[PDB]
Amino acid sequence: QPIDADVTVIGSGPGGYVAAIKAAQLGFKTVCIEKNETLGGTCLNVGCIPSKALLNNSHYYHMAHGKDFASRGIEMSEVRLNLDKMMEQKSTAVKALTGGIAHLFKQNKVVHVNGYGKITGKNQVTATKADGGTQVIDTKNILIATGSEVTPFPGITIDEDTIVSSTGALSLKKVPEKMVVIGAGVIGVELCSVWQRLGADVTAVEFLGHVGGVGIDMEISKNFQRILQKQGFKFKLNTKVTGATKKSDGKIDVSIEAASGGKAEVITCDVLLVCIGRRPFTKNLGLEELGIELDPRGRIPVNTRFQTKIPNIYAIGDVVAGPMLAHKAEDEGIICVEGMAGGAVHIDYNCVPSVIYTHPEVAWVGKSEEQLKEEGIEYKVGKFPFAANSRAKTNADTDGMVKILGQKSTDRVLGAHILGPGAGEMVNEAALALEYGASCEDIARVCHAHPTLSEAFREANLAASFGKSINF
């Protein structure tokens, strides 16, 4: 009882479920195979959505429990945490959005097959369900969107009990008294902040010498770290972990040393979060038998139409090269299926923004100062602090700055870097500016509403273009 299809998508994360919807909208008979109980992939079920929910809820807890609400005349005798209820709010959002994808599939006539997909021919995918039943799909095109998994730390076994990945850390049943996080990238700093805010003593251990992962601008990263340390973060940068021991009393002893060598020490904690990275997931997909070889980092090599070496078999998202982000996977899914229908296929990874949803937030798009130097680009800098922005000052939330990097000969915007309130939303104005090739003067002369945080983006461009802002 095989199914015939034009496009068969393996995986229902941001890349796969959006690709499936768009393919159906373009007229393809479309199937989407998912092995998990719900649709939406890593981002919806154990990723972006649960993490942002806990960041929001823990931020508001900090505002009520700390000094902020009192300073605004909102007085409360006793603020208490109900962690079960906070986790419930998180789970409600996840359930609503995963159900929403199932309805979108029905609305657009995408056939949902529940099982573990394996490519069993150039034009065939077989999905094996939990009970061993099979469903064969004979298909013109195959779109691999199988995503990522957590990168294990050699010698340390994650059990999601006291040694957790991001999945376990998002569902802890009590606030750990003491918590250690291996990895001070985006995911690690976010999860650190959640549990710090809810009462944990948190330490982030990082082999590199800065916070925030790859590609973040160094000046932004140092300033971000300083703000976080004032919030209660403790950082062990330039530090390697040599091992972790699960102890008889339930606690964990973590052995660390200086990254360059020496200064060996041990620190004890109640929960260890292993968050050193993620890697492409292709297990048992049938690639070896087809001859589709992986690159040394486990990614599927693809061409500019996202075709593998077998031209009707495609791959997108966290399973191929480029930034491992939800909106990147989505755009790759859209343009891949547009290309299947004969159209142009374009994504510019220099215009793909990054966001860290701490408070303050961090967001950037385009090039860092380190990248411009390494490329030998002559640039100029404009900065504007949020302390001088009217909306930030009115809200009494004034950490950080906007930094703009501009090309000297043309005034072209080369990069935008935002540390402070509203950075996540603000970077999308910046992404539009980079896609259009805007000059710094262009953005300085656009009438931004007053009072808005976006005026800091305008003023930083004015500084880069004219040399001087108005309000600083």
* Annotated binding residues for FAD: 34-43, 52, 117, 146-148, 318, 324-327
72-to-62, 196, 211 alpha-carbon distances in Å: 14, 23, 32
Smallest separation, CB 76 to ligand FAD (Å): 29
Q: What is the dihedral of CA 200, 201, 205, 206, to 10 degrees?
A: 70
The listed partner (a second copy, ligand FAD, none) that binds 436, CB under 5 to 8 Å by sort, is a second copy
Q: Is 435 in the site for a second copy (CB under 8 A)?
A: yes
Q: Does 329 bind ligand FAD (CB under 6 A)?
A: yes
Q: Between 207 and 466, name the residue whose CB sits nearer to a second copy.
A: 466
User: Beta strand 134-144 with 3-10: parallel, antiparallel or unpaired?
Assistant: parallel
Torsion of CA 25, 29, 30, 31, to 10 degrees: 150
56: its two tokens: 């929001």
Binding residues: 34-43, 52, 117, 146-148, 183-190, 206, 241, 277, 318, 324-327
CA–CA separation, 107 and 101 (whole Å): 10
Which of 168, 176, 317, 400 binds ligand FAD (CB under 6 A)? It is 317
Give least dist CB 301 to a second copy, A. Answer: 22
Question: In this chain, which stretch among 8-16, 372-380, 391-399, 459-467 interacts with ligand FAD, using CB under 6 A?
Answer: 8-16
Shortest Cβ distance from residue 18 to ligand FAD (Å)?
8
The residue within the footprint of ligand FAD, chosen from 8, 51, 454, 465 (CB under 6 A), is 51
Tell me which stretch binds a second copy (CB under 8 A): 119-127, 179-187, 309-317, 345-353.
345-353
State the binding string over 55-94 for ligand FAD (x if CB under 6 A, else -): ----------------------------------------
Q: What are phi and psi of 111, to 5 degrees?
A: -85, 120
What residue 21 binds from ligand FAD, a second copy, none (CB within 5 to 8 A, per partner kind)? a second copy
Shortest Cβ distance from residue 12 to ligand FAD (Å)? 5
> Looking at beta carbons only, is 257 or 441 nearer to a second copy?
441
258 interacts with, out of a second copy, ligand FAD, none, CB within 5 to 8 A per kind: none
Q: Which of the residues 309 through 338 are near a second copy (CB under 8 A)?
A: 325-328, 330-331, 334
Query: Rule CB under 8 A: is residue 347 a binding residue for a second copy?
Result: yes
CA distance 414 to 410: 11
Q: How many CB atoms lie within 10 A of CB 375?
A: 10
The entry of ligand FAD, a second copy, none that residue 10 binds, CB within 5 to 8 Å by partner kind: ligand FAD
Give the number of other CB atoms < 10 A from CB of residue 59.
17
324 contacts which partner out of a second copy, ligand FAD, none, CB within 5 to 8 A by kind?
ligand FAD
Are 266 and 254 in contact, with CB atoms under 8 Å apart? yes
Secondary structure of residue 28 in the 3-state scheme? coil
- Judge whether 270 and 162 are in contact, CB under 8 Å: yes
Decide: is 252 part of the binding site for ligand FAD (CB under 6 A): no
Asked whether position 280 contacts ligand FAD by CB under 6 A, the answer is no
d(CA 373, CA 366): 14
Which range, of 60-68, 169-177, 216-224, 298-306, touches a second copy by CB under 8 A? 60-68
Distances (CA, A) of 431 to 107, 434, 435, 438: 31, 5, 6, 10
Distance CA 93, CA 77 (A): 30
- Produce one character per residue of 132-147: b if its CB has 16 or more CB atoms within 10 Å, e if not: eeebebebebbbbbbb
CB 338 within 8 A of CB 312: no
Could you tell me which stretch among 44-52, 153-161, 374-382, 403-411 binds ligand FAD (CB under 6 A)?
44-52
Handedness of CA 182, 188, 189, 190 (dihedral sign): negative
* Catalytic residue positions, numbered: 450
90 vs 118 by CB, closer to a second copy: 90
Whole-number Å distance between alpha carbons of 150 and 414: 33
User: Is position 385 an interface residue for ligand FAD (rule: CB under 6 A)?
Assistant: no
β-strands 134-144, 148-150 pairing: unpaired
| CA dist., res. 108 & res. 363, Å (int) | 34
Nearest to 136 by CA among 4, 19, 11, 29: 4
- Residues with Cβ within 8 Å of residue 321, at least 6 apart in sequence: 295, 299
Number of residues that bind ligand FAD (CB under 6 A): 35
Site for a second copy in 95-124 (CB under 8 A): 96-97, 100, 104
Which of the ranges 135-143, 210-218, 300-308, 325-333 carries the binding residues for ligand FAD, by CB under 6 A? Answer: 325-333
* 454 counts as binding a second copy under rule CB under 8 A: yes
Give CA separation, 199 vs 62, 177, 183, 466, 472, in Å.
Answer: 10, 7, 20, 46, 38
Residue 442 sits in the site that holds a second copy (CB under 8 A): yes
Measured from the CB of residue 112, what is the shortest distance to ligand FAD in angstroms?
A: 11
212 binds, among a second copy, ligand FAD, none (CB under 5 to 8 A by kind): none
Q: Is residue 119 involved in binding ligand FAD (CB under 6 A)? A: no
Q: Which residues bind ligand FAD (CB under 6 A)?
A: 10-16, 33-36, 41-43, 47-48, 51, 116-117, 145-148, 166, 187, 281, 285, 317-318, 324-327, 329, 450
